Amino acid sequence: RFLKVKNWETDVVLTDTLHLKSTLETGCTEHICMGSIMLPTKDQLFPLAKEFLDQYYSSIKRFGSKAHMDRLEEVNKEIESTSTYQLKDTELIYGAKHAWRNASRCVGRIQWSKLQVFDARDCTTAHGMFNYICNHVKYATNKGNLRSAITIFPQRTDGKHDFRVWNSQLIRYAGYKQPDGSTLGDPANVQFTEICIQQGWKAPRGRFDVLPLLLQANGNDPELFQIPPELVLEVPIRHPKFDWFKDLGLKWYGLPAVSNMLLEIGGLEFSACPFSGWYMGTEIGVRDYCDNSRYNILEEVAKKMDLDMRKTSSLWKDQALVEINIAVLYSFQSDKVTIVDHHSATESFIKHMENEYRCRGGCPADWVWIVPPMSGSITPVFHQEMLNYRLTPSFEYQPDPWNTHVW
Amino acid sequence: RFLKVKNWETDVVLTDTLHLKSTLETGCTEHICMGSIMLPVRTKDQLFPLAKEFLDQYYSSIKRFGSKAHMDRLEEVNKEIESTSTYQLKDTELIYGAKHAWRNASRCVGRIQWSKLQVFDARDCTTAHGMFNYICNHVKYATNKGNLRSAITIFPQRTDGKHDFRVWNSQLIRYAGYKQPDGSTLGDPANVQFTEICIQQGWKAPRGRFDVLPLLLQANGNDPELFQIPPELVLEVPIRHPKFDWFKDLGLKWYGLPAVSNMLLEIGGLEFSACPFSGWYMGTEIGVRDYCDNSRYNILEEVAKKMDLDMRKTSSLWKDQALVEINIAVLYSFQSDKVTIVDHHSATESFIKHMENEYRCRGGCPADWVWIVPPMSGSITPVFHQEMLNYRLTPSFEYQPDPWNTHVWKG
Ligand code: HEM
Ligand code: HEM
Ligand SMILES: Fc1cccc(CCNCCc2ccnc(-n3ccnc3)n2)c1
Ligand SMILES: Fc1cccc(CCNCCc2ccnc(-n3ccnc3)n2)c1
Ligand SMILES: C[C@H](O)[C@H](O)[C@H]1CNc2nc(N)[nH]c(=O)c2N1
Ligand SMILES: C[C@H](O)[C@H](O)[C@H]1CNc2nc(N)[nH]c(=O)c2N1
Ligand SMILES: [Zn+2]
Numbered sequence: 001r002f003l004k005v006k007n008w009e010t011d012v013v014l015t016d017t018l019h020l021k022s023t024l025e026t027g028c029t030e031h032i033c034m035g036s037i038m039l040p041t042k043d044q045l046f047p048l049a050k051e052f053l054d055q056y057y058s059s060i061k062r063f064g065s066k067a068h069m070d071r072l073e074e075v076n077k078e079i080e081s082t083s084t085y086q087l088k089d090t091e092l093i094y095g096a097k098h099a100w101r102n103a104s105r106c107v108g109r110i111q112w113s114k115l116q117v118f119d120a121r122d123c124t125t126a127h128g129m130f131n132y133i134c135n136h137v138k139y140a141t142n143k144g145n146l147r148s149a150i151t152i153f154p155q156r157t158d159g160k161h162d163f164r165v166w167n168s169q170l171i172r173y174a175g176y177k178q179p180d181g182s183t184l185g186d187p188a189n190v191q192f193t194e195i196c197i198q199q200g201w202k203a204p205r206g207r208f209d210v211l212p213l214l215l216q217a218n219g220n221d222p223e224l225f226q227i228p229p230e231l232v233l234e235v236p237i238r239h240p241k242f243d244w245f246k247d248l249g250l251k252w253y254g255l256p257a258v259s260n261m262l263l264e265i266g267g268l269e270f271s272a273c274p275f276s277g278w279y280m281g282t283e284i285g286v287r288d289y290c291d292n293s294r295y296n297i298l299e300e301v302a303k304k305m306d307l308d309m310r311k312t313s314s315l316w317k318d319q320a321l322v323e324i325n326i327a328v329l330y331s332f333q334s335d336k337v338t339i340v341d342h343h344s345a346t347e348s349f350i351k352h353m354e355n356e357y358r359c360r361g362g363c364p365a366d367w368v369w370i371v372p373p374m375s376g377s378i379t380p381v382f383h384q385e386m387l388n389y390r391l392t393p394s395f396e397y398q399p400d401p402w403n404t405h406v407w
Numbered sequence: 408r409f410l411k412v413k414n415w416e417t418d419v420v421l422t423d424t425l426h427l428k429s430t431l432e433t434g435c436t437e438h439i440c441m442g443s444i445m446l447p448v449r450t451k452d453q454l455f456p457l458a459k460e461f462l463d464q465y466y467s468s469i470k471r472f473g474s475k476a477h478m479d480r481l482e483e484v485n486k487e488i489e490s491t492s493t494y495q496l497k498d499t500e501l502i503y504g505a506k507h508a509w510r511n512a513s514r515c516v517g518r519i520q521w522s523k524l525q526v527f528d529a530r531d532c533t534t535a536h537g538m539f540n541y542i543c544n545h546v547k548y549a550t551n552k553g554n555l556r557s558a559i560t561i562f563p564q565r566t567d568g569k570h571d572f573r574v575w576n577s578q579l580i581r582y583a584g585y586k587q588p589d590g591s592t593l594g595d596p597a598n599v600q601f602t603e604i605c606i607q608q609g610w611k612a613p614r615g616r617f618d619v620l621p622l623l624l625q626a627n628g629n630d631p632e633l634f635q636i637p638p639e640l641v642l643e644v645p646i647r648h649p650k651f652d653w654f655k656d657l658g659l660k661w662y663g664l665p666a667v668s669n670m671l672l673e674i675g676g677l678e679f680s681a682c683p684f685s686g687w688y689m690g691t692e693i694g695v696r697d698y699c700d701n702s703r704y705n706i707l708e709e710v711a712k713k714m715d716l717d718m719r720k721t722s723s724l725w726k727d728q729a730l731v732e733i734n735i736a737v738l739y740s741f742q743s744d745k746v747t748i749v750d751h752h753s754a755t756e757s758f759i760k761h762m763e764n765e766y767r768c769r770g771g772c773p774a775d776w777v778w779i780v781p782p783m784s785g786s787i788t789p790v791f792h793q794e795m796l797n798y799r800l801t802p803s804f805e806y807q808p809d810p811w812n813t814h815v816w817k818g
Binding site for chain 1 (some may be wrong): 416417722750781817
C-alpha cells in the first residue's frame with residue numbers, strides 16, 4: 001500500500017504516499033485495467049467541504065488553529081442554513097491551482113503554482129461572460145508571451161441555473177460538411193458549427209474561421225458573441241527549409257484554452273471555468289494536423305517532399321510527420337509566440353514529478369496522456385513508471401450542454 | 408457484463424464479453440491504475456480446478472465438450488493429480504496451450520499469427536547438453552535462412568521447484584556488454600550483468616561491440632552450463648541506409664532472430680519455466696529501443712552529428728530526425744538481405760484487423776496499449792486511437808525472477 005515507481009532508463013525509484021488520499025475512482029478493477037479508455041446535498045457537502053478546508057489550512061500551516069476551526073464552523077453553519085457555501089478568494093485561488101496540480105493528464109503542471117486566477121463569480125449574464133472571457137484571452141496571449149490563466153464563473157446551485165461555455169475551447173475553427181462528401185475546416189467541430197449556424201452565426205464558410213463563443217448564463221439559453229478578431233493571435237505555418245511549405249496555407253491559433261470542463265473545489269462545482277496555458281508543439285503538428293479525423297495533411301506534405309509513398313516501410317509518414325512538427329515550432333518561434341517542444345516539456349515534467357515526490361509524496365500521472373504522440377521512447381516520460389489516481393480539487397469532464405440544456 | 412471499446416479515429420465501437428474469463432489479477436484497483444507499471448511449489452488443492460478449467464477450454468475448442476473423451480480425460484488427470492501430485496499434458500494439449508499463451512499475450516502486437524506456431528516438445532530433455540541441442544534446432548528451424556518462422560521449445564515443467572529447467576539468457580540471441588574501468592560500456596549495456604555471469608562461469612569474451620553471448624543452461628535444478636551457439640547458425644544483418652553511404656561506417660549490425668528465453672509458460676496450472684519462443688522483429692524494437700534508448704547503444708547523437716543537424720536546439724527536433732533515419736536503415740537492411748521484418752505501420756494495422764476478428768470470433772482481445780503502441784510515431788498508427796481492455800487469461804506467459812537471484816548453487 002506504499003508503492004514504488006521506477007524509471008527504467010535512470011533506475012531511479014520513488015515512493016508514492018499521496019495516492020493514499022485518492023478519493024475519486026479510476027474505472028479500473030483487480031480484474032481489468034481501463035487505462036486506455038478516453039472517458040469512463042447537505043450531508044454529502046459538508047465532508048467534501050471539510051476535506052478541502054482541512055487541506056487548505058494545512059497548506060498555510062495554521063492547521064487545527066482557531067482560524068481553522070472557526071472557518072469550519074462558519075461554513076458548516078452556512079451549508080446547514082443555505083445548503084451551499086461560498087469560497088473565500090484565497091481558498092478559491094488555492095482550489096484552482098491545486099485542481100491543476102492534480103490534473104494527471106497535464107504534462108505542463110511544473111507551472112502549476114504560477115496560475116493567474118480571475119474570479120468571475122459576480123458575473124450574471126452572458127454578456128458579462130463575454131467581457132470576462134475577452135479579458136482572459138487578452139491577458140493570457142499577452143502579445144504572444146503567454147501566461148497561464150483561469151476565469152471562474154458562478155458555481156452551480158440547483159443545477160437549473162448553470163453557467164456554461166458551449167465551445168470546448170475558447171478558440172477553435174469551424175467545420176462544414178460539403179455537398180461534396182468531404183469536410184471544409186476542422187472536422188472536430190462540425191456539430192458545434194451546426195449549432196452556431198442554428199443559433200444564427202453567419203459562417204464565412206472558410207477552412208479556418210474562428211468560431212464564435214456560445215455563452216450560457218444562469219441556466220439561460222446561450223447567446224453568440226464573436227471574439228474581437230484583434231484578440232485572436234494566429235500563426236501562419238512555415239518550414240525553415242521547405243520554401244513550398246507555406247503554400248499549403250496552414251495557420252493555427254496561439255492560445256490553447258480548455259473551456260468545457262467542470263472544476264470541483266471543496267465540493268462545489270464550477271461548470272464554467274475556461275483555462276489556458278500554451279501549446280506543446282505536438283498538440284498542433286501531430287494531433288491537429290495529422291489525425292485522420294482532423295486536418296489530415298500528411299499525404300499532401302509527403303507528396304511535396306517527393307517521398308516514395310509506395311510502401312509503408314520507407315517511413316514516409318514518419319518523415320513528413322517530423323517536418324510538419326519542425327514547421328510548427330519554427331513558425332511560433334519566429335513570431336515569438338510561446339510554444340514548448342515535447343522533449344523540453346517532458347524533460348521538465350520529470351523534474352516536476354521529482355519535486356512532487358520529494359515535497360508532496362507523489363504526483364498523479366496518466367502515462368497514456370503524458371507521453372507525446374510522436375517519438376515516445378526518446379522523451380524521458382516513456383521510461384518513467386507513473387501511478388494514476390484522482391485527487392480533489394479536480395477538473396472533470398461533463399456532458400456536452402446541447403445534450404441536456406432545455407430551451 | 409458487456410464492455411465497450413471505442414475507436415477515436417473511426418468511431419467503431421466493440422464489445423467485450425471475454426474479460427469475463429479473466430481469473431488472474433491486474434495490479435489496478437478502483438483507487439489506482441497501475442497500467443504503466445512494468446511488473447504486475449503449487450498444491451494439488453489449487454491444481455485440479457486449473458487443470459479442469461484448461462481442459463474444458465481445450466475440449467470446447469475441439470467441439471468435444473462433455474464428450475466421453477472429455478470426461479475420461481478429466482477423470483484421468485484427476486487421478487494423476489491425486490496419486491502423483493502433478494500431471495502430464497498430451498501433445499495436442501501442449502500445442503493448444505502454447506498457441507493460446509501467445510493468443511492471450513496482451514503486450515504482443517504480433518498475435519495475428521497466433522495459430523501458425525511451431526511447437527517443439529522438449530519434455531524428454533534431461534540435461535543441459537540436451538537443452539543446447541534442442542535450442543540449436545530451434546534457432547536453425549526458426550531462422551530458416553532469413554525466412555523466419557515462429558517457434559517455441561518447451562522443456563519439462565516445474566515439479567517441486569527444486570528441479571527447474573531454466574535458460575539463464577534473457578533472449579537466445581543477444582550481444583555482450585562490458586563495463587569499462589572509465590565508466591563507459593562496450594556493446595550492449597542491457598547485458599553487462601549477465602555478461603559478467605558468463606565470464607565468471609568461464610566464457611572467454613572477445614570483448615567486442617557485437618559479441619554473441621553464450622547460452623547458460625540449467626537442467627533439472629542443476630547449476631547451469633555454458634554453450635556457444637554455432638556462429639553459422641546465428642544470422643546477422645549489417646545496417647546500412649539507402650541514401651546515406653556513411654551509415655554503414657557506423658559499424659552497426661543486428662541479429663535476425665528475436666527470441667524471448669526468460670518467461671514462464673503456464674498451462675492448466677502447470678509451469679514450464681524454460682520455454683524459449685521466437686517470432687520476427689518489428690523494426691522499432693531495434694532502431695528505436697535497441698539503438699536509441701540512452702541505456703542501450705545510444706547512437707542518436709552520433710547519427711545526428713553525421714547528418715549535421717542543428718543540435719544546439721532540441722526544438723530543431725534533431726533527435727526525431729535521426730530517429731526516423733535509423734529506423735529506415737534497419738528496415739532497409741533486413742529487406743535487402745531477405746530477413747523477415749515488419750515495420751510499425753504494417754504491424755499495427757495487422758493487429759487491429761486481428762483484434763477486430765477476435766472481438767467477432769472470441770468476444771474480446773486483451774491488449775495492453777502502453778506496450779502495443781509503437782515507440783515512435785504513436786498517433787499515426789491505427790492502434791493509438793484504439794481503446795483497449797487489458798486483462799489476464801490463461802494459458803499465459805508470465806515473468807519469473809532472474810535465476811541468478813534464486814538459484815541454489817551445488818558448487
Ligand atoms: C502551462 C502550459 C501548459 C502545458 C504545456 C499543458 C500541457 C497539456 C497537455 C499536452 C495536455 C494533454 C491534452 C490532450 O492531448 O488532449 C494537457 C491536458 C490538461 N491540462 Fe494542461 N498544459 C498547460 C497548462 C494548463 C493549465 C493552466 C491547466 C489548468 C489550470 C491545465 C490543466 C490541464 C487539464 C485538466 C488537462 C486534461 C485535459 C483533458 O482531459 O482533455 N493545463 N495539458
Ligand atoms: C510473429 C512475429 C511477432 C512479432 C512481430 C511480435 C511483436 C512483439 C513486440 C513488438 C512485443 C513487445 C516487446 C517489447 O517491447 O519489449 C512483443 C511482446 C511479446 N510477444 Fe511477440 N511478436 C511476435 C511473435 C510472438 C510469438 C511467437 C510469441 C509467443 C509464442 C509472442 C509472445 C509475446 C509476448 C509474451 C510478449 C510480451 C513481452 C514481454 O512481456 O517482455 N510473440 N511481441
Ligand atoms: F478529440 C478529443 C475528444 C474528446 C476529448 C479530447 C481531449 C481534449 N483535451 C484538451 C485538448 C486541449 C486543447 C487546448 N488546450 C489544452 N490545454 C491547455 C492547457 N492544458 C491543456 N488542451 C479530444
Ligand atoms: F529492460 C526490460 C526489462 C524487463 C522487460 C523488458 C521488455 C522485454 N520484452 C521482450 C522483448 C523482446 C526481445 C526479443 N523478442 C521479443 N518478442 C519476440 C516475439 N515477441 C516478443 N521480445 C525490458
Ligand atoms: C484511446 C487512447 O486512450 C486515446 O487515443 C488517447 C491516447 N493518448 C492521448 N494522449 C493525449 N495527450 N491526449 C489524448 O487525448 C490521448 N488520447
Ligand atoms: C515504464 C513503462 O511502462 C515502460 O517504458 C514501458 C512502456 N511501453 C513499452 N512498450 C513496449 N512495446 N515495450 C516496452 O518495454 C515498454 N516499456
Ligand atoms: Zn488500470
